[PDB]
Symmetry: D2
Subunit: 414 residues, 4 copies
């Protein structure tokens, strides 16, 4: 019906059928934007959106194998996704044990690339027979890099000098830190371009990746800066000086999120039996591929074989922002001869800009929390704020090193 359908809606939506609510869209009665709140259950809302979508597609049977039933939409709606028509299953394999810092980890990897999980698993095996890997977090601080503008370059210079004094920095730090308990503003990084001023705010953010919290603190910091400099115009809360989800030398040099190093010595016996190559062959490929090769290609921060493969796979499994693989994959892989007879392989990976978290975003979803719980880093750390996210970053750097070892060995053997 048409008129009777509106009456029952005013009382609920359960008494109206699927075909009746879809008829309210077609025959203009009530618009399409009112759909999330109106329907009772979340799963039925997804079903009605899929039927509406089906008639717009040139092949309505497209959605047949896109699944949607029995998924927990309660944590997704109004938090992680909009216009939800279902979910996308990504196969999850396991590579391990990764022997890292006197512990053993089973690393979940969501991917559809054949041989990737198997390769990473072989890398872990080589590391494990070689006495294990060790890693350190060198720095920690998510950033946001707004652009502001003053009437003149002489004015923007005045603002830069003011922020660089002990007093000016104290005023902006107090504003920034007041927005949340984990907001602790580190030293600012500023760059002038004429009358423009790019300001890089950096702060730890507990176990969150921290972009929402740092953005809150930045908005408050710029409002405080407005009081001391009324002619200043906030052009954008991000002027790409952060830098988020684009390649940027500033992330490579200053770091962003977690800066991490990892290392291991692979005994000569393990290089031959597990990796099917030699230490000499591995060093030759590493120098001429990951250093010289990347140099000839004009790379900034891409001094590695396939760090992005491991970063992406762990990120999708563990509820991270996979778009941040742009900067998070930044990595330099070094190799040299080691031990008394110089036949053992010393490997290290350095990743200055791993953008990561174990609370918020996709880490609030239960399947993603399962993969985080495998690693023992799910949620916030009560006793040591930021320790779970720090640990996950160490696991990412260590797993990348396992991937580097294995693929470089395949390339070396020919």
């Amino acid at each position: 019906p048409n008129e009777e359908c509106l009456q029952i809606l005013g009382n609920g939506a359960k008494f109206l059928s699927d075909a009746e609510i879809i008829q309210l869209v077609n025959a203009k009665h009530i618009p399409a934007y009112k759909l999330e709140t109106l329907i009772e259950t979340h799963e039925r809302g997804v079903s009605i959106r899929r039927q509406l979508l089906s008639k717009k597609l040139s092949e309505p049977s497209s959605l047949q194998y896109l699944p949607y039933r029995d998924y927990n939409y309660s944590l997704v709606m109004g938090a992680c996704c909009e216009n939800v028509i279902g979910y996308m299953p990504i196969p999850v394999g396991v590579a391990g044990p990764l022997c890292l810092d006197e512990k053993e980890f089973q690393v979940p990897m969501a991917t559809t690339e054949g041989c990737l999980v198997a390769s990473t698993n072989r890398g872990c095996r080589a590391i494990g027979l070689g006495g294990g890997a060790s890693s350190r977090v060198l720095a920690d601080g998510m950033t946001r890099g707004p652009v502001v503008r003053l009437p003149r370059a002489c004015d923007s210079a005045e603002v830069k000098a003011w922020l660089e004094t002990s007093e000016g920095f104290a005023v902006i730090k107090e504003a920034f830190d007041s927005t949340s308990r984990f907001a602790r503003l580190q030293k600012l990084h500023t760059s002038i371009a004429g009358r423009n001023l790019y300001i890089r705010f950096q702060s730890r953010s507990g176990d969150a990746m921290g972009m929402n919290m740092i953005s809150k603190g930045t908005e408050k910091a710029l409002s405080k800066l407005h009081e001391y400099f009324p002619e200043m115009q906030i052009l954008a809360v991000s002027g790409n000086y952060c830098t988020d989800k684009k390649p940027a030398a500033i992330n490579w040099i200053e770091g962003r999120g977690k800066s991490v190093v990892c290392e291991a010595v692979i005994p000569a016996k393990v290089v031959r039996e597990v990796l099917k190559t030699t230490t000499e062959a591995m060093i030759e490929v590493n120098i001429n591929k990951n250093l010289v090769g990347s140099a000839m290609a004009g790379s900034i921060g891409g001094y590695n074989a396939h760090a992005a493969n491991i970063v992406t796979a762990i990120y999708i499994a563990c509820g991270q922002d996979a778009a941040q693989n742009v900067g998070s994959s930044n990595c330099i892989t070094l190799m040299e001869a080691s031990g008394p007879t110089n036949e053992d392989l010393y490997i290290s990976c350095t990743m200055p800009s791993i953008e990561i978290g174990t609370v918020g975003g996709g880490t609030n979803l239960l399947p993603q929390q399962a993969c985080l719980q495998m690693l023992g880093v799910q949620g916030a750390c009560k006793d040591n704020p930021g320790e779970n996210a720090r640990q996950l970053a160490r696991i990412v750097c260590g797993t990348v090193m396992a991937g580097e070892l294995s693929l470089m060995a395949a390339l070396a053997a020919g």
Copy 2:
């Protein structure tokens, strides 16, 4: 639970608890179960149980799902050591009015506001007459490193590859490996006695990594016949460049190079995007050009192309790790129209690495999202037209995302 003595006699008759009790007691090794178990879902079940005992929290796997998923197309193709699947929420933004067509773009993400933002950008484009796009180039690459005894020798190989006859014989060996293998002009760079050779070729509708790799191996084998002292050091010497940031991809292109554009009426910028044309151009210059410049960016002259690229890629069975290079984008904005109050926008993406056959596009859920766009599988009549169409949709959806986010930043919300 029976003893392990009468368990030695195949798999279907035994129980799950029996197989795991033979792995720990060490009757059977740990690499026999992949082949012996018949039903693929039961293979994943046993793997999860063995995995559970290695974890400090064995119950961590409970909410990682695995039942009733189609593992037939995954095993021996897409993933190893499989313990389940990870559901990523899929939203839809559209219609995207692109080249006199309308697209409903699937986006797999867990970032709030992303799909709604892109949807708003699509609406502004549609009310402004739509967008137009063009594929400027097409060719996946692979960039091996070879070594000769001396720099004079590597120089000889470079000059030889640059003659018409030397290139012709290398092109012959390359193209023999596949129906779609058609080698384009080579790009070579010397570093002492090293020579980096950038093989480029179309690959039908595939992303083309496996095909170009096979062509490269046969091409280098032919080059070995003419230069027997040459050593193939690595089939990839990072000169491709695959899954790392590289200026060579930005300048020369990799996969599909694409451009897209649209004019948004001044009224549409005000009412839909809640800003002005003047404010949009101001932010684009000082964020996407000057800001990226101050940050030392190569190819990152955009707001958040990577967000859209990643969401479409995960939804459509692409290699998400290739978002590193595929997200390369320069967003440009200027005034347009008679009164100079309309907003011309353009996005240029020189290295979209993409495909509609092979890899994750073999799986049915991923094929469902590809089918929404009308690009699933190989185009029989025009090989590569589906992959090219998907690249255009990516670039157009990126432009929609740029429009919407830049408007949010420009109005200072």
Copy 3:
């Protein structure tokens, strides 16, 4: 005794008298009253040198310290070849000390390399590198490419239109038409394959061509102008925004020069015996490779370098460029260099070295190479002027000498760093 401005104007306005009759103070009177422009002083006055003397006196009164130009030399210099070609508003010349480093044993020949510098120990260091190369049986080098570029930016109404122009330039027929127009501007113009890049409705076109022994800036620009005019006949809606849209790229750092090359791309190499590494360079092969990997590769990588995978190629390039009449501002791109080092020989104790420099922008005709003093330095190397029998051979040879001298400088500085001196 000085005279009125009007009386001096009637004498210089006359043909048979000239500035010879007038004094210094009287000519200064005419310039200050704007009857005679300052920049034309050479033309009006009887000699070039007196024109420079008058300009100096004009300038000295403007300065807070009138005796500032005392030790800036100017007398007895050949200003005839500078005027209307190399410099304007000339107030003298700047002496840069010139040292010699050699012999450099390169491609079975020997070179005495001139180096203009004020940096202590640079010439001596480079000289030590030459000595090490000479005792190791010399260096070999190859020119891998040759072609100066210009990278204009044009614009179409739409990106769909700029795309059409790109596709048209990539057809065999379209490239042929543009090639005919480019090559019609000079006998040395041979247009190579076009490299194009779109940015929306913008189109950046990279024209590349040999240029005889000239660096080729002017010749490539003239060919580019004619080529774009021909392109406009097929596409009347195209606007030539700028003849250089920074896509060349000239005198700015750019990955496109590193990857595609610009001017001459060159590679050079040598093997230094272990004995020579110990006795001349005061280090070992193992220590040299260790420093090269971690400084010139890893170190440059950590600093975010594109093209700067070397110790100090720019010191050598700059010193040779100033001495040999080159454009010293082009050291920005010409200094692009990757230095590689590894073990060699039967006991893995000898030191293989190589330098690869893809973008040496250089010439032996035109610009500063027209001046006699810098022609003297070119004549040392046997590369002065145009090679008639093999056009471009002299400029090619100079690029090889630059690359080989850089390698000598890399050897010597890296040895000093490896020893911890």
Copy 4:
């Protein structure tokens, strides 16, 4: 007249006779017979000019064309300040034409800028830019930072050890000990915030400090030796692999100089009235902005440039550097510049321009600035030598003049490109 070998040697040994008593042809005979090596021809000869003449004669016979040095000048140059300080194996000097562009109206002062070049139209073009700036009310500039750097590479046995050293350097007390050692080497030394980067067991340490009016290369390297020696005491397993590990970065392109700055970071600006853009520059403000955006921003972006967002800053930097006794090889990094242009004023017809140069490496004492001809060009600008009442003011002033002259050159060349 040319005496036998042994008769010439006995006079040389006697220190109250020397090589003055002998002739030119006799000294050449002593070099070829291998009695006295060629490198030791500086000290033995009496006057510096004669020593250069003898080196030139020995060189001439080695060359395929013995008359090649004919037009390379050498006579009557003051070699006293050059020998053992600025150049070795000296065979003469190379005259670079010097032109003047000005007045440059900068910070309420007027400057006559010397420019050593052989590129036609460069000085005249720069001069036209200065004239446009002057008729527009002048330019204003600011020094935003000042600190020469050196970036050694050290190595610990493990990455965990290199991590420990990084953390130690980041504490207040660790940095204080290193700053005390660094600052002790010179009265102008003041070590700023230390900036480090790990690569496995490598640690790259970027030392930064002001250096008075010197470019500071020698000063910073000496302070860095002392700093690393002090760090050796707390970490004896550390190995100084190289005093420069290319992390400075000196004389190579590097994003670190672009982002962190090196030497003087400077900004300059001016507004050119619409009337002056039309008449002097022969173009419009609209055409200028359009060329600047699509050439200096979009164009440099398409070429994959880091720090090269300008038309020809390198031309001006190089011309001033050679004229003023600077290290011209440092033009690689000193040329780093971004040029921005906007519409300005009430009709939106005036042209606002700015140039930002984060890494001008420069000095007014030491190096080639010790030579008299180079000191004359520095004297033109009022920046010769060390400022006693404010150490670093002369070098800061020259940096501002460079940035201002670059902006003048940017204005003029961009106008010629815009006009077609």
